[PDB]
Amino acid sequence: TTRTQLPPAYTNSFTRGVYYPDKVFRSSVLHSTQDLFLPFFSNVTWFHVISGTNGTKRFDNPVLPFNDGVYFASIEKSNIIRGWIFGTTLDSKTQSLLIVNNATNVVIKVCEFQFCNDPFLDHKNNKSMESEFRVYSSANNCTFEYVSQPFLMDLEGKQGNFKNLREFVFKNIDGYFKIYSKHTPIIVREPEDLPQGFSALEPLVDLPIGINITRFQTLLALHRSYSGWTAGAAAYYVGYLQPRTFLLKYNENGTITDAVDCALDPLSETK
Amino acid sequence: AGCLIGAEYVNNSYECDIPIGAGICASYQTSQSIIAY
Amino acid sequence: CAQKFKGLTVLPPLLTDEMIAQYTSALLAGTITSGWTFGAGAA
Amino acid sequence: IDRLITGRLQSLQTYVTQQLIRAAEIRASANLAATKMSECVLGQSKRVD
Amino acid sequence: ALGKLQDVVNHNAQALNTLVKQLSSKFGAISSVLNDIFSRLDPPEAEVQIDRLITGRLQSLQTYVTQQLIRAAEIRASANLAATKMSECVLGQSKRVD
Amino acid sequence: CTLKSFTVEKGIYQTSNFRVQPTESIVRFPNITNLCPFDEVFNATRFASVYAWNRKRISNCVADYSVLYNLAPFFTFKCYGVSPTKLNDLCFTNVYADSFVIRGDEVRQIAPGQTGNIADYNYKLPDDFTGCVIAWNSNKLDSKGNYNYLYRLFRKSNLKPFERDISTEIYQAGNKPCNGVAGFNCYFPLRSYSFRPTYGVGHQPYRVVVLSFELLHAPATVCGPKKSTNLVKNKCVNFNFNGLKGTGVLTESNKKFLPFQQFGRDIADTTDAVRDPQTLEILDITPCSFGGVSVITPGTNTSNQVAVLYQGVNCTEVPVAIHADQLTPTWRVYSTGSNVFQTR
Amino acid sequence: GTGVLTESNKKFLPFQQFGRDIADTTDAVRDPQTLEILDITPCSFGGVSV
Amino acid sequence: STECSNLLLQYGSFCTQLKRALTGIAVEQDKNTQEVFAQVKQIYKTPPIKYFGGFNFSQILPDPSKPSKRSFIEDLLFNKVTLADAGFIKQYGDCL
Amino acid sequence: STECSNLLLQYGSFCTQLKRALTGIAVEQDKNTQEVFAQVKQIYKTPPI
Ligand SMILES: *[C@@H]1O[C@H](CO)[C@@H](O[C@@H]2O[C@H](CO)[C@@H](O[C@@H]3O[C@H](CO)[C@@H](O)[C@H](O)[C@@H]3O)[C@H](O)[C@H]2NC(C)=O)[C@H](O)[C@H]1NC(C)=O
Ligand SMILES: *[C@@H]1O[C@H](CO)[C@@H](O[C@@H]2O[C@H](CO)[C@@H](O[C@@H]3O[C@H](CO)[C@@H](O)[C@H](O)[C@@H]3O)[C@H](O)[C@H]2NC(C)=O)[C@H](O)[C@H]1NC(C)=O
Ligand SMILES: *[C@@H]1O[C@H](CO)[C@@H](O)[C@H](O)[C@H]1NC(C)=O
Ligand SMILES: *[C@@H]1O[C@H](CO)[C@@H](O)[C@H](O)[C@H]1NC(C)=O
Ligand SMILES: *[C@@H]1O[C@H](CO)[C@@H](O)[C@H](O)[C@H]1NC(C)=O
Ligand SMILES: *[C@@H]1O[C@H](CO)[C@@H](O)[C@H](O)[C@H]1NC(C)=O
């Protein structure tokens, strides 16, 4: 549609973006690790996926550069966002990825696809195989496939009044693709800022592909206005990563409960 | 000793608490801030 | 100046040359005007 | 550069060890000076020489 | 006010901790694990690779012994002073000032 | 012997140390794997040049190096930096044979430590490459004026590793870009690859393949199988969990590992626990007992009777009747005729 | 090398090129364009305390 | 590492002097305590009556109401310093 | 030379120990001076005569 641009804003990330760096289990020790992490109190962009212009589709799928990592998050009430297509230039001549959630399969499909200008999906399945696979029309050559249980184990069948706090980190390095995730409940209905609380991003899956990624794209699920294609309200956060030095304090259980960096302020370096 | 940033000098003379050097010491007192004397 | 560079510095002493002189003057005055009674209590 | 680093580290360690050794002599001299001050200036000493 | 007794324990614990932690240093070798360096290298260069680690560990042990002797000297001096103070204050009356 | 004298005075001396050797060897490896064809990665009527870079993937397979010798024309399997004798049972992860055909007239350049014009333009060979050199007698089949095996002699400049030449971009050295003409100072990769028999000893492209290597960064993926053996408890044994060498006593543990967590460590940056590769059981690794020995003697000028002090070990663990598998062979210390006394 | 190039008061002989000090380190250099030499002093460095 | 034992033998005697120095340090540590404390050849006992001119010595004299004959102030000092010590156990039984 | 620092980094921490050893002596010097000279509680003065 002839939609207009929107001004991206920023918010304080507080203490967020901590994942287990190493496989080895340790308890009651204060280990210091040097790896890429989200700096404490850094600007994170907070695109608001609301009903655009009271029912007009918006282009809230920006072609954001991947750089070295992302801190994609979600404070959605329901499931609206599926799809993390990566690509050098997002065309049929470039190998591209996509993490769909059709039925109960991740469907890790590593091939070349021709992508439409505005890819989107339907949250409700079509009546009488659905025609949801309109994001691409042709696939040329294929190398790797991975089908398993969906990455998202969160369910909304219990009741309402509680939203999701999905968190993800997409790190690609030296021919590997690691995925980390964690879900926690939310008490306050305000989506302006993330609650201040430590969370551990346990690893979920590792990929051996060696694709070159220079951009990040996201997809949305809009089944029908029930003019245009629309659904409810949503919001996701995008944050970049740079190498840093961190100190982690394991507990008796062996889980990371708090972390202190070594570059934020003089007290941090003293610690 | 050098350049000190983050402390306010006072003319009152107190007993030394944290030795900065060259006869100057710093301490936390009265709202509340770090002073050098 | 004074070698310097290569990460070789000298830290100044905590007590300057005037406080030491004040201490010595106080000791001399106490010894002269009190004897040895100022070393065990009041002068 | 590995061998150069090893040599420079050896020199630095030797210097630190010599400084540590001399610090003990300075400490002993300071203790003797403090004792002599407390026993000669603040009172009268009966110890010979 | 018992910081003098705690300082000795802290110094000894710190020295032991740094001696233990010094084992993980590579010393410029290919690997810090004896089994991996033995299995992943041929005899012609494994000898010098092991020799580098041996020299580093010997240097660490020599240093540790040196500071242990240096600390023992001060401890002996303090013990002599304490013995003199005991013999001169407890077993009699002292006229020495302070 | 340790005092280097024939006379010993009254006192206590430290002589040596005691330890317990391992008694059994235990290997525990995953029972799931696939057959590994070493030279079946390529299957075509005619091979391609370096520009192809397309091949089937080989992984999660039993890399038995005896299969390499089984093939008749296989010759080269030695690694420059690692002895093949240890490589016979070494485990690696994500190792595949690259598909690229080069002249092979520079043997020293393929190995790490040398870079040349071919490395400058065609494909960079850094001085520190983890891959090994693998070759086999297949020159006659691949080799056959005939310039089908195109090679990029000239490029813009030197290229970093993995920046292979796929899209041909000819050199530009003028105000106007080279547009359809192979003029002066502008070169094209279209030239004969020296297929003529004038150099029949060898000049034709010889298949040199380098294989990427990973050193225990992940659980072992490709390596030959070994005889798995049931684990034992309360015995100083040689455990080979996950292909890692070790020696210690295996016992039950309550270290609550996370679903993905495998290993375990303590403040001493050393291993402390391990999970069974087959069953979902957690065990803690600890070495079997050791200590020091002190000899108490009244002096050789009086008598030859001695007493032996074992430091830091309970009397039950090391009695005077154990001679099955320990250090100190002739050290019987007689028996319980003289009572054993337990001290601090 | 890195240093604060500034004016110099050293009287180099007409043939002399380089300068040295007691610690055997570079102290002055000959100007290629002109005949006026320059001093080399490393810029500020030090340690911090909290 | 059985090979490393043979390789280290090529470096001469780099273990005898270390052991000798450590043994000398331990012997000196024992001698220090013997010099400081062992100053009396007799073990005297306080009288059963604890009246000494009106002075009260109950806070420093030992009391038999404990397995260790330590005074109140000695117990306070021991509790103050017990944050770090040798370990109080060296029998290896509790070491896993 | 930052590359020299990189080739030094694998030698463990041989710099923190030296810094602590020197800071110990630096702290001890002030105590040595104070033990000798700071032996009085008040600053006495002499009469004008
Ligand atoms: C380490 O993780 C555990 C959870 O796995 C934390 O909670 C502990 O969980 C165990 C298992 O239920 C509790 O044991 C139970 O204790 C009750 C009595 O309170 C008893 O009736 C049950 O039969 C069972 O034995 C345990 O009490 C509970 N808390 C603690 C302190 O162990 C545990 O807190 C985590 N560790 C730390 C230091 O937080
Ligand atoms: C010498 O000094 C000791 C220690 O101060 C004196 O013993 C103390 O005596 C007082 C006076 O009775 C005790 O206070 C009260 O004692 C009762 C006893 O049942 C207790 O229930 C109260 O809560 C309160 O504490 C005090 O406990 C006691 N101290 C000890 C360690 O026993 C002693 O009387 C003095 N002797 C002379 C001759 O002055
Ligand atoms: C960071 O966020 C603050 C608050 O929104 C804003 O004022 C500032 O310009 C932002 N900085 C950058 C570099 O985006
Ligand atoms: C403190 O002393 C300085 C001189 O050292 C003087 O300039 C200043 O006015 C004084 N401030 C007062 C007395 O408040
Ligand atoms: C082989 O390994 C798998 C790992 O999932 C395990 O489930 C299976 O029980 C093992 N086979 C046997 C015979 O134990
Ligand atoms: C030795 O015996 C057992 C273990 O063998 C245990 O009580 C402790 O380690 C020791 N006990 C005594 C009384 O020495």
Residue G13: phi, psi to the nearest 5? -70, 155
Q: What is the DSSP letter of F309?
A: E
Q: CB-hemisphere CA count at 13 Å for I22?
A: 14
* Residue B27 burial by Cβ neighbours in a 10 Å radius (0-12, 13-18, 19+): middle
Q: Name the helix (H) or strand (E) containing E9.
A: helix E3-21
Separation of CA F272 and ligand 6 centre (Å): 24
Classified as helix, coil or strand, A3 is: coil
Q: Tell me the sheet residues that pair with F134.
A: F209
Q: Can you tell me the distance from the alpha carbon of A202 to that of C2, in angstroms, rounded to the nearest whole number?
A: 56
Residue E23: count of CB within 10 angstroms of its CB: 15
SS3 E59: helix
Chain C residues lying within 8 Å of E98, measured CB to CB: 39
- Largest Cα–Cα distance in chain E? 76
Distance from C-alpha of F328 to C-alpha of F319, rounded to nearest angstrom: 13
Any atom of ligand 5 within 6 Å of the Cβ of F278: yes
Phi and psi at residue F148, to the nearest 5°: -65, -30
- Among all ligands shown, which has an atom nearest to the Cα of A7? 3
Please tell me which residue of chain E has the smallest CA distance to H24: E69
Nearest to residue F248, comparing CAs of F276, F292, F291, F289?
A: F289
Q: Is the CB of H91 under 6 A from ligand 6?
A: yes
CA distance B3 to chain C (A): 14
Residue of C nearest to B18 (CA): C14
Domains of chain A by residue range: 10-271
CA distance A207 to A179: 8
Q: Are F109 and F174 in contact (CB under 8 A)?
A: no
- Stated in angstroms to one decimal place, the resolution of this structure is 3.0
User: Helix-strand-coil percent breakdown of chain A, rounded to 5?
Assistant: 5, 30, 65
Handedness of CA F8, F9, F12, F13 (dihedral sign): negative
3 state DSSP class of A266: helix
Chain breaks in chain C (C to N over 2.5 A) after: none
Place of tokens 């002055």: G28
Tokens for F310, please give them.
Answer: 């074992």
Can you tell me which residue has the tokens 């940033």?
B5
Give the DSSP per-residue string, D9-35.
Answer: HHHHHHHHHHHHHHHHHHHHHHHHHHH
Query: What are the CA-CA distances from residue H76 to residues A112, H58, H70 (Å)?
Result: 77, 14, 10
- Amino acid identity, residue A196? Q
- Neighbour subunits, G (≥3 Cβ pairs < 8 A): A, C
- Which atom of ligand 2 has the smallest separation from the CA of H51? 38
E20, E21, E39 ranked by CB distance to F86: nearest = E39
- Using DSSP bridges, classify how beta strands F236-241 and F25-28 pair: parallel, antiparallel or unpaired: parallel
Q: How far apart are CA A201 and CA A182, in angstroms?
A: 5
Q: Which atom of ligand 5 is nearest to the CA of F31?
A: 1
* CB proximity list for A83: less than 8 A, separation 6 or greater: A98, A99, A100, A119, A121, A135, A217, A218, A219, A220
- Cβ within 8 Å of residue F5, ≥6 positions away: none
Alpha carbon separation from I11 to A67, E66, I31 (Å, rounded)? 32, 20, 34
**Residue ranges around ligand 2 (CB below 6 Å):** H 56, 58-59
Pairwise CB contact (< 8 Å): D34 & I22: no
d(CA A134, CA A114): 10
Q: What does DSSP assign to residue C4?
A: -
CA torsion through residues H4, H5, H8, H10, sign: negative
CA angle A85, F166, F103 (to 5 degrees): 140
Q: Where are the alpha helices (DSSP H) in chain A?
A: 266-270
User: Is-contact F295 F13, C-beta < 8 A?
Assistant: yes
- Residues A11, A179: Cα–Cα separation, whole Å: 24
User: A10-271 has which CATH code?
Assistant: 2.60.120.960
CA torsion A131-A134-A140-A142 (nearest 10°) is -70
Query: How many CA atoms within 13 Å lie on the side-chain side of H95?
Result: 14
Bridge partners of residue A261, in order along the sequence? A246
Dist. CA H29–CA F284, nearest whole Å:
38
CA distance A189 to A184: 14
- Cα E94 versus chain centre, distance: 39
Asked if F256 and A23 come within 8 Å (Cβ–Cβ), the reply is no
